[PDB]
Amino acid sequence: ARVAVLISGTGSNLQALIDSTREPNSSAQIDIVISNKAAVAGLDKAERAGIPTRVINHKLYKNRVEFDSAIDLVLEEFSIDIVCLAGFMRILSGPFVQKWNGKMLNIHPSLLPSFKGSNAHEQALETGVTVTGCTVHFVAEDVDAGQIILQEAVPVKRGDTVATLSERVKLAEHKIFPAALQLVASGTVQLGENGKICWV
Numbered sequence: 001a002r003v004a005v006l007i008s009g010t011g012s013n014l015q016a017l018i019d020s021t022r023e024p025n026s027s028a029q030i031d032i033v034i035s036n037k038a039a040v041a042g043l044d045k046a047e048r049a050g051i052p053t054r055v056i057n058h059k060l061y062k063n064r065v066e067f068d069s070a071i072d073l074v075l076e077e078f079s080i081d082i083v084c085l086a087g088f089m090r091i092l093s094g095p096f097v098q099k100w101n102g103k104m105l106n107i108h109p110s111l112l113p114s115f116k117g118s119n120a121h122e123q124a125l126e127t128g129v130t131v132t133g134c135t136v137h138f139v140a141e142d143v144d145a146g147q148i149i150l151q152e153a154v155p156v157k158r159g160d161t162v163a164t165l166s167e168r169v170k171l172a173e174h175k176i177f178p179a180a181l182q183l184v185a186s187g188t189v190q191l192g193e194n195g196k197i198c199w200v
């Protein structure tokens with residue numbers, strides 16, 4: 001499968017995915033890395049891996065849909081089959097999400113449906129769970145309300161902060177995200193006609 005990876009910052013998930021798709025049995029191929037914010041470290045790990053990078057600036061488009069279309073042009077230019085959101089902090093418009101329905105994966109640092117949204121670790125710590133984790137799911141029009149592919153639980157140690165909790169969750173992210181991509185690229189997992197996760 002031809003894969004695009006959309007980032008916004010560090011790209012430690014991107015790096016984790018790069019490492020796995022370089023493996024001989026990878027069903028996946030990272031053909032383009034797109035970022036909405038220039039001069040972010042994800043663009044380096046990508047360039048350091050010899051992967052084309054493209055910066056599309058959401059702040060330069062009048063419409064959110066004009067902005068998604070900028071991305072789809074590149075997705076079609078690179079003949080992409082699968083889109084991985086790896087730290088991408090822009091909500092996509094309905095038609096774009098509909099177009100890539102069942103072809104777009106996201107990594108979210110909670111055990112969904114818990115702690116939907118942008119400050120999941122903050123939420124988890126205020127609530128006081130002792131177990132959190134991360135989730136790979138399909139992007140649906142309901143933000144973080146798509147079909148789950150993989151999940152890994154991670155412990156909340158006492159005295160944790162966003163800094164430490166998120167350090168620990170990210171190690172799990174770096175496992176289930178490559179795994180999930182491989183599941184979808186290989187066609188082992190798909191989005192069933194009934195709209196639930198379908199194993200094959």
Ligand SMILES: Nc1nc2ccn(CCCCc3csc(C(=O)N[C@@H](CCC(=O)O)C(=O)O)c3F)c2c(=O)[nH]1
Nearest residue numbers: 088089090091092097106117118139140141142143144
């Ligand atoms: N339909 C659908 N679309 C998309 C697009 C990306 N995702 C995955 C979740 C991304 C993480 C995320 C969760 S909330 C939020 C946010 O507040 N975004 C602000 C911009 C803030 C900023 O510019 O820093 C905004 O764009 O208004 C996020 F960025 C989805 C999805 O799951 N579903």
Ligand SMILES: NCC(=O)N[C@@H]1O[C@H](COP(=O)([O-])[O-])[C@@H](O)[C@H]1O
Nearest residue numbers: 009010011012013087108109117118
């Ligand atoms: N609400 C969405 C969200 O916060 N997603 C989070 O962004 C990070 C990407 O890190 P990276 O840039 O090092 O791959 C991840 O920690 C992921 O859980």
